[PDB]
Design a protein around this ligand. Structure first.
Ligand SMILES: O=C(O)[C@@H]1O[C@@H](O[C@H]2[C@H](O)[C@@H](NS(=O)(=O)O)[C@@H](O[C@H]3[C@H](O)[C@@H](OS(=O)(=O)O)[C@H](O[C@H]4[C@H](O)[C@@H](NS(=O)(=O)O)[C@@H](O)O[C@@H]4COS(=O)(=O)O)O[C@H]3C(=O)O)O[C@@H]2COS(=O)(=O)O)[C@H](OS(=O)(=O)O)[C@@H](O)[C@@H]1O
Lengths: 195, 196
């Protein structure tokens, strides 16, 4: 088992689908547990119809307490899951951007710089940055859609992060200025891209 | 516009499917709007390094004020989408239960009641009640996963809802006890259905 944990999720399974799978398994698990408590609570009422008022209330508090704890388990478990997933998504985005950056840079530094390759590379880099930008916007748009008091406190951070991304992109494009002859032939190509 | 709304979504598209696509279209639309505002605000930050404090504060308030309005629209828009969808999910479940009930009833009221047809109609009806049961349990589980306090508030209502469902099933089954032979005949098969 500790061995299964070491191996973890197969490489063929992305973080997104692994996350959903895990979330789904937990949903079904907890649903079964809850159904059990609710069924037990029902049976208890039935065999309690003939008892002292006090003992009835006691039965109620018993099941309501079992549910309180279960609700707290479900809430804590979900938070852990969302936590791990968010931290991994951010890491993958930075990793993909960094790898795209190196690719672009390698194409620009190839003895006879090849146009089509440098173009596909810069394209990949730009998409990597765009992914981070979309993620920033979407997460903010999402927090606004389900938690307004929290969205308000994100404004400035989002404002700042989006500018960071845009400056990074400009600085990266500057890597081209290093090869005027190259920057020339591609001037039109990249010009279309910017859009 | 008003005509396309009347016709609504094509038959090819399920409610679940139409809900996601609508949700995604809105998400994309809002991402664009937000990005535009954010870009303007940045430009203003650039342009205003040289303006009186009072004016710089107004500029800030001006953009924060626009994001607030945008946040409220995103939120309200989602609540509406979520409400429309939830209402449609519950209507479909009620509709299916009632159609299934009518079918169970019809099989029961045939001149020579065929145990095979009765068993199948009853099965479909119990599956309808089971769907509502799962939907009730899942919604409760989801509220606890994201909003524990509200989960506490609905707890007794869910418990009560589950009991209402159970009582309907027993009542519907009771309809079958008005025919002993048939009941005795389908008994073992019904138990497997209920124990599922
Ligand atoms: O904590 C919460 O609030 C969670 O809310 C619900 O999930 C949210 C996500 O949290 C939210 N992430 S966001 O950053 O705020 O936008 C958003 O997820 C969608 C985004 O497009 C992507 O999320 S992200 O974390 O990767 O940034 C992600 O996209 C997937 C895409 O769906 C996949 N398509 S698929 O056909 O292959 O499945 C594929 O392209 O991979 C993409 C991710 O790529 S990645 O580079 O590996 O990251 O997931 C999207 C998605 O899940 O829809 O929106 C989610 C849903 O929001 S909402 O409509 O419910 O409001 C969930 O709550 S709940 O569903 O349990 O009730 C749960 O995840 C959290 O509670």
């Amino acid at each position: 088992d500790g061995v299964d944990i070491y191996f973890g999720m197969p490489g063929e399974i992305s973080e997104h689908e692994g996350f959903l799978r895990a979330k789904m398994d937990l949903e079904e698990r907890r649903m079964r547990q809850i159904n059990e408590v609710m069924r037990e609570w029902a049976m208890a009422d039935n065999q309690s119809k003939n008892l002292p008022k006090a003992d009835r209330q006691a039965l109620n508090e018993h099941f309501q307490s079992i549910l309180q704890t279960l609700e707290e388990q479900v809430s804590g478990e979900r938070q852990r899951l969302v936590e791990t997933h968010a931290t991994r998504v951010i890491a993958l985005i930075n990793d993909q951007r960094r790898a795209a950056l190196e690719g672009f840079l390698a194409a620009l530094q190839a003895d006879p710089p090849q146009a089509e390759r440098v173009l596909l590379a810069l394209r990949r880099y730009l998409r990597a940055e765009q992914k981070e930008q979309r993620h920033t916007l979407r997460h903010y748009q999402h927090v606004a859609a389900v938690d307004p008091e929290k969205a308000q406190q994100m404004r400035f951070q989002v404002h700042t992060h989006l500018q960071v991304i845009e400056e990074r992109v400009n600085q990266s494009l500057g890597l081209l200025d290093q090869n005027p002859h190259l920057a020339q032939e591609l001037r039109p190509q990249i010009q279309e891209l910017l859009h």
